[PDB]
Design a protein around this ligand. Structure first.
Ligand SMILES: Cc1cc2nc3c(=O)[nH]c(=O)nc-3n(C[C@H](O)[C@H](O)[C@H](O)COP(=O)(O)OP(=O)(O)OC[C@H]3O[C@@H](n4cnc5c(N)ncnc54)[C@H](O)[C@@H]3O)c2cc1C
Ligand SMILES: Cc1cc2nc3c(=O)[nH]c(=O)nc-3n(C[C@H](O)[C@H](O)[C@H](O)COP(=O)(O)OP(=O)(O)OC[C@H]3O[C@@H](n4cnc5c(N)ncnc54)[C@H](O)[C@@H]3O)c2cc1C
Ligand SMILES: O=C(NC(=S)N1CCOCC1)c1ccco1
Ligand SMILES: O=C(NC(=S)N1CCOCC1)c1ccco1
Ligand SMILES: O=C(NC(=S)N1CCOCC1)c1ccco1
Lengths: 588, 588
């Protein structure tokens, strides 16, 4: 075990020092590398279990069993006296900077995973480049550094969700004694977009400052992997060149799909365009039923829009369908219209967008319902949210040999390695993994540590918690009820559930029995919690802490013995007792 | 072992059936019992792993070894043939109601713990009485069934906190694009109090309905334990009488203290008076620094009041003091004034309360600082929040033999038993236990199950999480940092921490580095999490789920391997890395 690890670590690290904590000679070398501003990894052997087995194996590289020992890109450099010789003769800088490649690491893609990987690698002395380019949308929309979440995803969508939530805060304030009249207050779309975009701009700037402060080279250029170690780059003037790298991380993400129907690309938009749109959408049709579709429809309706959602089959395919139906029912009762069992056939243009006066155009949507009946209605804006896909044919020469699956995503090992040994993939393009920003960040940071600091920890992709930020939010961790029943059988599954009412909703005269939670449990395994589900306000804050308990294998008895915090929504999980099998009502 | 449990279970259960799940003669008895509306406990011997031994020890009571066996108040009643004989001869009803005492259980006190205990006991056939009486405050305030939390505690205080939080929602709404002008909106105290009190009234009514529906006798009378089984009751007409009970549960709670200074009782008020006050307090002095003091000062200032807090020594004594200082700093930066190191000497009346025009009076407060300098200022209302105390000399004759500690609270075993074998105590009067509503509820329900249904589960009072609902909320679970260091020594303690900014605060232009969290860990026990602390919005929702993980022994590694939910405040707990010993700044 120890030998294949130490070999892999020395071969991969850019600059690494084997040390001990009590070591005064080691202190001498650390102080020299610090003064020289040479970054490096450090492996303190006195804090590792097999530290003695390792110390003796280092001599197969250096012929000494003593500490400190410093290596650079696989080569032993010397002990304390020797390193000070190089430092004294001004030979050290040339030694630590000698490499077969331009960079130790090239990251293709500057989003959630790629920026995290690149910054973490540079901390251990890896010479790193991050490449980012944003292909414009069909109407020409583009944006800065940071990826999908930062510019056209989690960040602007939750800010517009908060704008919508504040509509009910205004309604509630009257009941709690404040003197405003909600009916006389309106919303200004362009004022919201300006504030959201100013925040996004601060994040674009922050990432560029962060890369420079970590000595990471940022290239605003499109990358193409043409051989295992060669990346062809095309810059903003279409100047083409080639850079070389030891390790490669692919982190290029996905973009929205369009349906293959007339007028879709020409006259519709996607979430890529929505978050910087310079006019209010007006009367809007959202086509699709993913979490993107429902999140966007929800805040547009709370901001005063006339909103319709067109649903081919079900809502939130892949999520617990009891919960998905509750999500949709709340939306329908609070101002969102649904066109059910329906698809589009054609989008026709009736008026062009008025870019001078900041007004939408007008469109005619023709479609049909699943029995055969026809759909025909006019909308000012049509938004497609029908899935996302990678486009690695742009990024990856087939001759390189990186295997993809039938969806176009990269087939990886459990340590993110592709079928080419020095090439790795992280984030949304890694086949079979949850497509979420904190997953991409953890994968990128953990991989960087394995490549350049001798770490062994892997990313754990199981039981990753989620939240859908619909008008009433939905948090989940673990299996849906139907997946648990399929895996283990109905007689081995027990479900505890309850409605609840937030205390904040009492004086505000909101609904008694719409919020809801359940625990899906396995009888034959000590009533283990397989899945947790909650529909209610602040659902992401509620859910997050329980994800640690589920990671540790919580049972129903662990929830029972823990005491609630009063008054909160979350405490209802600590006293659940009504089972679905019992048939007793869950109402409050 | 087994036989001590069986004798205790048979002796104290009111009506109990020993059974097996596959037992047609057991089903025959079950069907007769609740056709006759006879409530009872049931123990299914095949569900227990020593049921074979239990079934044999039953013969020491009944001289038979089969199931079913039915018992009433310690007496074997019969097997299947015998119970059916009593039924068809119309003898069963009188048998199940034979008792040495008027009640199987008398609960003294109708609050959080007492209502929970009484309702649970009745489920198993215990004939139960709940006594509740509310001694009026010095100015005459009184209220209905449900205890301190429902009427003058958690429920109205969090509703008034919400009214305060909505002030910032009105401010934020402009930045998110809404057309209102916060500076032209004012608050109406009396409108808010009316809505709060209408909800409280619905809870008073709901508890009376619940007790009637469970066949619990509710007496609105003051109780006094005059011997181990006799309770003297005084009703609202001063009619005095005596009732007897087998088991007694003391659940009488606490009331606010007043300082022994001139004018305090005559001219000041407490939290008992605040939540139904018919006029706005106006310019207010809060004397004290408990969570009650700071929560009340905080919402009064958010509702537009001129508020000062007079602090004898420190804020939130007994809570982590770094967190307490940050709580106070936020309040002082957001409109609360503090008179530090200061105590009151006298309250003098300048104007009587105007009960016609519905206006406060006016008071002169004289006090002094610890260095001897004088304090003198005028206020419309003075609120005392200087602790709470029981008054069991009003409930408990000294000759009964129930032992009290130096603070007047009841000394109990770990199963709530007092020094008198049939008398138990729960809730705030149980010495040494956290004084919280969910603790009192769990203790009451678990005790009723042990008395009348043969349960063995004890209440676990360790690592109970808390939240202080100040203008910026403070949630906690486990040890303070200073208690951890005192117990294990500084070299064995590692603290990870970070500032954070809620995404909702970005477009609203709120503060960058005020919200804060830390994990207090033990190095020599695998970095076990000894305490968790968070200052931020929705802190109670954030904290609750982590209480389950801490109950199961979470380590720092467990937090690290769990993935965050983005974008949330809570996710910052999943990526903490800055230690206090590194000296690295926690700002973000
Ligand atoms: C509307 C929406 C809302 C979302 N909300 C949430 C949410 O609330 N929570 C959550 O956890 N996740 C959310 N997500 C998902 C989250 O955005 C993604 O999981 C995450 O951004 C994926 O990170 P990544 O590093 O894999 O790719 P990305 O963040 O997409 O970054 C890849 C980058 O590489 C660039 N690139 C592509 N090809 C090349 C090339 N050849 N050369 C150079 N650069 C290239 C791309 O333009 C992009 O900038 C949301 C997604 C969407 C669309
Ligand atoms: C301002 C304030 C805010 C609080 N906020 C919170 C919070 O957010 N969260 C939380 O968990 N806890 C909170 N608490 C604490 C919570 O109120 C108590 O822990 C809880 O009410 C204790 O329940 P109990 O059954 O022990 O007593 P109580 O609820 O006080 O009930 C005792 C009852 O018995 C009655 N009684 C007394 N003597 C007799 C007698 N001789 N005969 C008959 N009846 C009698 C009393 O009048 C009262 O109705 C708060 C307390 C205060 C004061
Ligand atoms: O047969 C197809 N399904 C159809 S039309 N519908 C299902 C959804 O509800 C409306 C009708 C099909 C083939 C290509 C696209 O659709
Ligand atoms: O995906 C790959 N899996 C394999 S076989 N391994 C990693 C290297 O050796 C140990 C196992 C891979 C390796 C080289 C190119 O692709
Ligand atoms: O021992 C206590 N209670 C009583 S009366 N018993 C328990 C043990 O079994 C015999 C009866 C007690 C209560 C508070 C401190 O000690």
């Amino acid at each position: 075990g120890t030998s294949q690890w130490l070999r892999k670590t020395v071969d991969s690290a850019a600059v690494i020092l084997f040390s001990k904590t009590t070591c005064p000679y080691c202190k001498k070398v650390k102080d020299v590398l610090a003064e020289a501003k040479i970054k490096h990894a450090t492996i303190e052997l006195d804090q590792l279990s097999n530290g003695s087995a390792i110390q003796k194996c280092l001599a197969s590289f250096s012929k000494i069993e003593t500490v400190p020992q410093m290596f650079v890109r696989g080569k032993f450099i010397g002990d304390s006296q020797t390193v000070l010789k190089y430092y004294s003769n001004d030979e050290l800088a040339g030694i630590v900077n000698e490499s077969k490649y331009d960079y130790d690491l090239i990251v293709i893609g500057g989003g959630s995973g790629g920026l995290a990987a690149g910054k973490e690698a540079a901390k251990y002395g890896a010479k790193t480049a991050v490449l980012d380019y944003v292909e414009p949308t069909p109407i020409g929309t583009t944006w800065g550094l940071g990826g999908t979440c930062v510019n056209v995803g989690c960040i602007p969508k939750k800010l517009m969700h908060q704008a919508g939530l504040l509509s009910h805060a205004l309604e509630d304030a009257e009941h709690f004694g404040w003197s405003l009249d909600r009916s006389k207050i309106s919303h200004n779309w362009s004022t919201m977009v300006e504030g959201v975009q100013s925040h996004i701009g601060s994040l674009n700037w922050g990432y560029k400052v962060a890369l420079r402060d970590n000595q990471v080279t940022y290239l605003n250029a499109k990358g193409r992997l043409i051989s295992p170690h060669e990346v062809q780059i095309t810059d903003k003037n279409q100047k083409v060149s080639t850079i070389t790298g030891n390790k490669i991380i692919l982190a290029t993400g996905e973009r929205p799909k369009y349906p293959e129907i007339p007028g879709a690309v020409e006259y519709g938009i996607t979430s890529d365009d929505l978050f910087s749109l310079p006019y209010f959408p007006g009367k809007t049709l959202v086509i699709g039923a993913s979490y993107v579709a429902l999140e966007c429809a929800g805040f547009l309706a709370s901001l005063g829009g006339d909103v319709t959602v067109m649903v081919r089959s079900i809502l939130l395919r892949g999520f617990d369908q009891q919960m998905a139906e509750k999500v949709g029912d709340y939306m329908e009762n609070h101002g969102v219209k649904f066109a059910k069992l329906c698809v589009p056939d054609e989008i026709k243009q009736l008026k062009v967008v008025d870019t001078e006066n900041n007004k939408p155009g007008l469109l005619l949507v023709k479609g049909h319902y699943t029995d055969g009946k026809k759909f025909e209605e006019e909308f000012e804006t049509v938004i497609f949210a029908v899935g996302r896909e990678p486009q690695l044919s742009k990024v990856l020469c087939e001759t390189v040999g990186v295997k993809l699956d039938k969806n176009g995503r990269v087939v990886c090992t459990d340590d993110e390695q592709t079928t080419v040994s020095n090439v790795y993939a992280i984030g949304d393009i890694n086949a079979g993994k949850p497509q979420l920003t904190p997953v991409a960040i953890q994968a990128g940071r953990y991989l960087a540590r394995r490549l350049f600091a001798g770490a062994t920890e892997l990313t754990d992709y199981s039981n990753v918690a989620t939240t859908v930020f619909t008008p009433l939010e939905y948090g989940a961790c673990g299996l849906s009820e139907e997946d648990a029943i399929e895996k283990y059988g109905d007689k081995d599954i027990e479900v505890y559930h309850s409605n609840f009412k937030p205390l904040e909703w009492t004086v505000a005269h909101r609904e008694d029995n719409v919020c809801y939670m359940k625990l899906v449990c396995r009888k034959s395994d000590n009533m283990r919690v397989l899945g947790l589900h909650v529909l209610g306000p602040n659902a992401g804050e509620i859910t997050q802490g329980y994800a640690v308990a589920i990671k540790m294998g919580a049972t129903k008895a662990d929830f029972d013995r823990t005491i609630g915090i009063h008054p909160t929504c979350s405490e209802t999980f600590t006293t659940l007792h009504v089972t679905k099998k019992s048939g007793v009502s869950p109402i409050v």
